[PDB]
Amino acid sequence: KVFGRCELAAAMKRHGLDNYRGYSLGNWVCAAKFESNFNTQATNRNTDGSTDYGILQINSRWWCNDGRTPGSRNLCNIPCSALLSSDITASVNCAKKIVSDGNGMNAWVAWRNRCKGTDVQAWIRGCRL
Numbered sequence: 001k002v003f004g005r006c007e008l009a010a011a012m013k014r015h016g017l018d019n020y021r022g023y024s025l026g027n028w029v030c031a032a033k034f035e036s037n038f039n040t041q042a043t044n045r046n047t048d049g050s051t052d053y054g055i056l057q058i059n060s061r062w063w064c065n066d067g068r069t070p071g072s073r074n075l076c077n078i079p080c081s082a083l084l085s086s087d088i089t090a091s092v093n094c095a096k097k098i099v100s101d102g103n104g105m106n107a108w109v110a111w112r113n114r115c116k117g118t119d120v121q122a123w124i125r126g127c128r129l
């Protein structure tokens with residue numbers, strides 16, 4: 001599913017991401033924009049053989065099981081395929097664990113490089129939330 005900008009903002013708010021760990025909704029929408037262009041089915045292979053999945057490009061090294069990432073963990077206790085669902089529940093629940101891990105949203109290098117420090121509220125501007 002490719003979400004619209006305000007549609008994803010609303011879904012993320014519904015699932016409790018707005019101000020989760022102190023990160024405003026626009027942070028999350030911005031990160032989703034640059035990780036996946038709002039596409040739940042986005043996948044990206046990493047040089048290390050891990051793969052990133054879904055709207056927030058969650059990695060198989062630590063967070064989900066895909067059966068093809070040697071030596072990896074599955075800390076969200078999910079098949080990586082759940083991260084590709086039109087239902088963002090599994091992505092959101094897993095993102096909550098990731099952002100709680102110590103480094104906040106810096107875990108998403110695209111967030112650090114493209115969203116951090118910017119006018120992230122622009123990402124929810126105009127939306128009925």
Ligand SMILES: [Cl-]
Nearest residue numbers: 004005033038
């Ligand atoms: Cl957009």
Ligand SMILES: [Cl-]
Nearest residue numbers: 024025026121
């Ligand atoms: Cl915001």
Ligand SMILES: [Cl-]
Nearest residue numbers: 065066067068
């Ligand atoms: Cl497996």
Ligand SMILES: [Cl-]
Nearest residue numbers: 067068069070
């Ligand atoms: Cl594996």
Ligand SMILES: [Cl-]
Nearest residue numbers: 072073074075
């Ligand atoms: Cl594990």
Ligand SMILES: [Cl-]
Nearest residue numbers: 065078079080
């Ligand atoms: Cl599994």
Ligand SMILES: [Cl-]
Nearest residue numbers: 011086087088
């Ligand atoms: Cl949803």
Ligand SMILES: [Cl-]
Nearest residue numbers: 021103104105
């Ligand atoms: Cl933080």
Ligand code: NA
Nearest residue numbers: 054055056057
């Ligand atoms: Na994701």
Ligand code: NA
Nearest residue numbers: 060064072073
């Ligand atoms: Na894994």
Ligand code: NA
Nearest residue numbers: 087088090091
């Ligand atoms: Na999901």
Ligand code: NA
Nearest residue numbers: 034113114115
């Ligand atoms: Na950018």
